[PDB]
Each structure stands twice: as structure tokens, then as C-alpha cells.
Amino acid sequence: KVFGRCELAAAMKRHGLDNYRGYSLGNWVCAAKFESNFNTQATNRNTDGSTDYGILQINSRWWCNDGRTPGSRNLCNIPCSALLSSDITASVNCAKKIVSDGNGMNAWVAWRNRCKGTDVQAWIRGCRL
Ligand SMILES: [Yb+3]
Ligand SMILES: [Yb+3]
Numbered sequence: 001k002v003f004g005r006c007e008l009a010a011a012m013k014r015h016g017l018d019n020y021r022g023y024s025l026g027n028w029v030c031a032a033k034f035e036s037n038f039n040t041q042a043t044n045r046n047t048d049g050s051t052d053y054g055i056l057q058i059n060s061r062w063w064c065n066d067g068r069t070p071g072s073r074n075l076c077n078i079p080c081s082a083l084l085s086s087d088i089t090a091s092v093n094c095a096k097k098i099v100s101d102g103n104g105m106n107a108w109v110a111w112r113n114r115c116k117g118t119d120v121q122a123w124i125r126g127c128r129l
Contacts, residue, residue: 001086002038002039002040003038003039004038005029005123005124006124006126006127006129008032008055009025009124011088012028012029012088013025015088015089016092021096021104023104025123026120026122026124027105027115027120028095029120029123029124030123031056031105031111031115032055032056033123034110034111035052035111036056036057038055040054040055040083040084040088041054042057048061049069051066051080053066053080053081053083054083054084054085054091055083055088055091056083056091056094056095056108057108057110058076058080058095060072060080061073063076063094064076064079064082064083065080076093076094076097078090
């Protein structure tokens with residue numbers, strides 16, 4: 001599923017991401033835009049052989065199991081394929097674990113480089129929330 005901006009913001013709010021660990025909703029919407037272009041089915045392979053999955057591009061080295069990243073951990077206890085669903089619940093729940101880990105949203109390279117320190121509220125502007 002490819003989300004619209006306001007549709008995704010509303011889904012994220014319902015799943016408890018607004019101000020989760022101090023990150024306002026616009027941060028999460030901005031991160032999703034630049035990680036996956038709002039596409040739940042996005043995948044990207046990394047040089048170390050791990051793969052990033054889904055709307056928030058969660059990595060198989062630590063967070064999910066895809067059966068092909070030797071010596072990886074599955075800390076979200078899910079198959080990586082679950083992160084590709086039109087239902088964002090699995091992605092959201094795994095993201096909450098990641099952002100609690102110590103490095104905050106800096107775990108997402110696109111967020112650090114394209115969202116951090118910008119007017120992230122613009123991403124939810126005009127949305128009925
Ligand atoms: Yb660690
Ligand atoms: Yb440590």
C-alpha cells in the first residue's frame with residue numbers, strides 16, 4: 001500500500017506515535033516519506049547483506065528475521081515480511097523498540113539527514129487529526 005501523507009499521519013497517531021519518546025508526529029511522517037516514499041512494500045539491500053523493510057526501512061541485522069542475514073538478532077521477534085503489510089501495526093511496534101534503544105530517531109539515516117532540525121510540523125499541516 002502507498003499511503004497518502006494525511007492518511008499515514010492519522011494511522012500513526014492512532015498507533016501512539018505522536019510524541020512517543022518526545023518525537024512529534026511530523027518527525028515520523030517525514031521519516032517515512034524519505035525512507036520509503038510512503039510505500040509499505042519498499043525493500044533495500046545493504047552492503048553487509050542485511051535488508052531494510054517496509055515503511056520505516058527496518059533492518060534485518062538487528063530487528064527482524066528474513067532467513068538470509070547470518071548472525072543477526074531478530075529483536076522485534078517477527079519475520080521481516082510482516083513489515084511489508086498494508087497494516088502498519090508491526091512496523092510501528094518495532095519502531096517503538098528501536099527509538100527507545102538509546103540513539104533515538106538517529107537510527108534512521110533519512111531522518112537524521114533530511115528531517116532533523118527542519119520544520120517537521122509541515123508534514124502534518126492541513127491534516128484532519
Ligand atoms: Yb546495541
Ligand atoms: Yb551499552
